CSV table of C-alpha atoms in Angstrom, one decimal:
chain,number,residue,atom,x,y,z
A,1,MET,CA,20.7,128.5,-46.9
A,2,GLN,CA,22.7,130.8,-49.2
A,3,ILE,CA,23.3,134.5,-48.3
A,4,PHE,CA,25.4,137.1,-50.0
A,5,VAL,CA,27.9,139.3,-48.2
A,6,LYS,CA,28.8,142.4,-50.2
A,7,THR,CA,31.5,145.0,-49.4
A,8,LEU,CA,30.9,148.6,-50.5
A,9,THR,CA,34.1,148.3,-52.6
A,10,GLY,CA,32.9,145.7,-55.3
A,11,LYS,CA,33.3,142.3,-53.7
A,12,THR,CA,30.5,139.7,-53.2
A,13,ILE,CA,31.0,136.7,-50.8
A,14,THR,CA,28.5,133.8,-51.0
A,15,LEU,CA,28.0,131.9,-47.7
A,16,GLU,CA,26.0,128.8,-46.6
A,17,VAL,CA,24.5,129.7,-43.2
A,18,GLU,CA,21.8,128.4,-40.8
A,19,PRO,CA,19.0,130.7,-39.6
A,20,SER,CA,20.1,130.0,-36.0
A,21,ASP,CA,23.7,131.3,-36.7
A,22,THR,CA,24.6,134.3,-34.6
A,23,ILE,CA,26.0,137.4,-36.4
A,24,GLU,CA,29.3,136.6,-34.7
A,25,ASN,CA,29.2,133.1,-36.2
A,26,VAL,CA,28.7,134.7,-39.7
A,27,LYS,CA,31.7,136.9,-39.0
A,28,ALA,CA,33.7,133.7,-38.1
A,29,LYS,CA,32.6,132.2,-41.5
A,30,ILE,CA,33.8,135.4,-43.3
A,31,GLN,CA,37.1,135.1,-41.5
A,32,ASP,CA,37.4,131.4,-42.6
A,33,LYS,CA,36.8,132.4,-46.2
A,34,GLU,CA,38.4,135.9,-46.6
A,35,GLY,CA,40.9,136.2,-43.6
A,36,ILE,CA,39.3,139.3,-42.1
A,37,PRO,CA,39.3,139.2,-38.2
A,38,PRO,CA,35.7,139.2,-36.8
A,39,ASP,CA,36.7,142.2,-34.5
A,40,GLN,CA,37.1,144.4,-37.6
A,41,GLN,CA,33.8,143.3,-39.3
A,42,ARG,CA,30.5,145.2,-39.1
A,43,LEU,CA,27.6,143.5,-40.8
A,44,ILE,CA,24.5,145.4,-42.1
A,45,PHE,CA,21.1,144.4,-43.3
A,46,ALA,CA,18.3,146.8,-44.4
A,47,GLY,CA,20.6,149.8,-43.6
A,48,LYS,CA,21.1,148.7,-40.0
A,49,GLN,CA,24.2,147.4,-38.3
A,50,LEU,CA,23.6,143.9,-36.8
A,51,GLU,CA,24.3,142.8,-33.2
A,52,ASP,CA,26.9,140.0,-32.7
A,53,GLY,CA,24.7,137.9,-30.3
A,54,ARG,CA,21.5,138.0,-32.4
A,55,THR,CA,20.7,135.4,-35.0
A,56,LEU,CA,20.0,135.6,-38.7
A,57,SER,CA,16.5,134.4,-37.8
A,58,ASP,CA,16.1,137.4,-35.4
A,59,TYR,CA,16.7,139.8,-38.2
A,60,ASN,CA,14.4,138.0,-40.7
A,61,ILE,CA,17.4,137.2,-43.0
A,62,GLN,CA,15.9,134.9,-45.7
A,63,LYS,CA,17.6,132.7,-48.4
A,64,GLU,CA,19.4,134.9,-50.9
A,65,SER,CA,19.4,137.9,-48.6
A,66,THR,CA,22.3,140.4,-49.0
A,67,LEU,CA,24.3,141.6,-45.9
A,68,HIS,CA,26.8,144.4,-46.4
A,69,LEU,CA,30.2,144.2,-44.8
A,70,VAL,CA,32.3,147.3,-43.6
A,71,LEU,CA,35.4,147.3,-41.5
A,72,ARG,CA,36.2,149.2,-38.3
A,73,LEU,CA,40.0,149.5,-38.4
A,74,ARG,CA,41.9,150.9,-35.4
A,75,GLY,CA,44.8,152.2,-37.6
A,76,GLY,CA,42.7,153.9,-40.3
B,1,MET,CA,32.8,171.5,-50.8
B,2,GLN,CA,29.9,169.1,-51.9
B,3,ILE,CA,29.9,165.5,-50.7
B,4,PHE,CA,27.2,162.8,-51.1
B,5,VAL,CA,25.9,160.7,-48.2
B,6,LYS,CA,24.2,157.5,-49.5
B,7,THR,CA,22.2,155.0,-47.4
B,8,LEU,CA,22.3,151.3,-48.5
B,9,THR,CA,18.5,151.6,-49.0
B,10,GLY,CA,18.3,154.0,-52.0
B,11,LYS,CA,18.6,157.6,-50.5
B,12,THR,CA,21.3,160.1,-51.5
B,13,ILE,CA,21.9,163.3,-49.3
B,14,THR,CA,24.0,166.1,-50.7
B,15,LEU,CA,25.9,168.2,-48.0
B,16,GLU,CA,28.2,171.2,-48.2
B,17,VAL,CA,31.1,170.5,-45.8
B,18,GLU,CA,34.6,171.9,-45.0
B,19,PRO,CA,37.6,169.6,-45.0
B,20,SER,CA,38.3,170.5,-41.3
B,21,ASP,CA,34.8,169.2,-40.3
B,22,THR,CA,34.9,166.3,-37.9
B,23,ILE,CA,32.9,163.2,-38.8
B,24,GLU,CA,30.8,164.1,-35.7
B,25,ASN,CA,30.1,167.5,-37.3
B,26,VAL,CA,29.0,165.8,-40.5
B,27,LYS,CA,26.6,163.6,-38.5
B,28,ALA,CA,25.2,166.8,-36.9
B,29,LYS,CA,24.7,168.2,-40.5
B,30,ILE,CA,22.8,164.9,-41.4
B,31,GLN,CA,20.7,165.3,-38.2
B,32,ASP,CA,19.9,168.9,-39.3
B,33,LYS,CA,18.7,167.8,-42.7
B,34,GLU,CA,17.2,164.3,-42.1
B,35,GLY,CA,16.4,164.2,-38.3
B,36,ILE,CA,18.6,161.2,-37.6
B,37,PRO,CA,20.3,161.4,-34.2
B,38,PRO,CA,24.1,161.4,-34.5
B,39,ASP,CA,24.3,158.6,-31.9
B,40,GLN,CA,22.6,156.2,-34.4
B,41,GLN,CA,24.7,157.2,-37.4
B,42,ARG,CA,27.7,155.3,-38.7
B,43,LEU,CA,29.6,156.9,-41.6
B,44,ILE,CA,31.7,154.9,-44.1
B,45,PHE,CA,34.3,155.8,-46.7
B,46,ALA,CA,36.2,153.3,-48.9
B,47,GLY,CA,34.6,150.4,-47.0
B,48,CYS,CA,35.8,151.6,-43.5
B,49,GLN,CA,33.8,153.1,-40.7
B,50,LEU,CA,35.0,156.6,-39.8
B,51,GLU,CA,35.9,157.8,-36.3
B,52,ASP,CA,33.8,160.7,-34.8
B,53,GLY,CA,36.8,162.9,-33.8
B,54,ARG,CA,38.8,162.7,-37.1
B,55,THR,CA,38.2,165.2,-40.0
B,56,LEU,CA,37.2,164.7,-43.6
B,57,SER,CA,40.7,165.9,-44.4
B,58,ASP,CA,42.2,163.1,-42.3
B,59,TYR,CA,40.4,160.6,-44.4
B,60,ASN,CA,41.3,162.2,-47.8
B,61,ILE,CA,37.6,163.0,-48.5
B,62,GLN,CA,37.6,165.1,-51.7
B,63,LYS,CA,34.9,167.2,-53.4
B,64,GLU,CA,32.2,164.9,-54.7
B,65,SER,CA,33.2,162.0,-52.5
B,66,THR,CA,30.5,159.6,-51.4
B,67,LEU,CA,30.1,158.5,-47.8
B,68,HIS,CA,27.8,155.7,-46.8
B,69,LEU,CA,25.4,156.0,-43.9
B,70,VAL,CA,24.2,153.1,-41.8
B,71,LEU,CA,22.3,153.1,-38.5
B,72,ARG,CA,23.1,151.4,-35.2
B,73,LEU,CA,19.6,151.1,-33.5
B,74,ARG,CA,19.6,149.7,-30.0
B,75,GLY,CA,16.1,148.2,-30.3
B,76,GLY,CA,16.1,146.8,-34.0
């Protein structure tokens, strides 16, 4: 299924995901496409930060859902 | 100075802050106004999560800047 991943800075990523994908697996897909290390990524749905070991299914993420991506950078 | 704090769910909070305020002190102001515990709050500027012990000055937060607020909820 297609989901959108949007930064708060004006970039939309489209991903093909499975409902059984963990949030960490989605971060790996974002690294594959955009080169951002999973350790720096924080994914958000419905205003809440998502936990790495839960699945898209666990969070009721449906086709065409939008996740937001923000970074946790150690340097800044 | 005035800043905006916006959720990703359609709520804008206006705060009066000082540039020497820590990010934790801003979370305390959000708790005072909205009743959200600081421990659940994550504040974001320019697509990056902000660190509790740094100041608005440290992050170049200017008058009329917008921070985003997301929650880290242990249960959901």
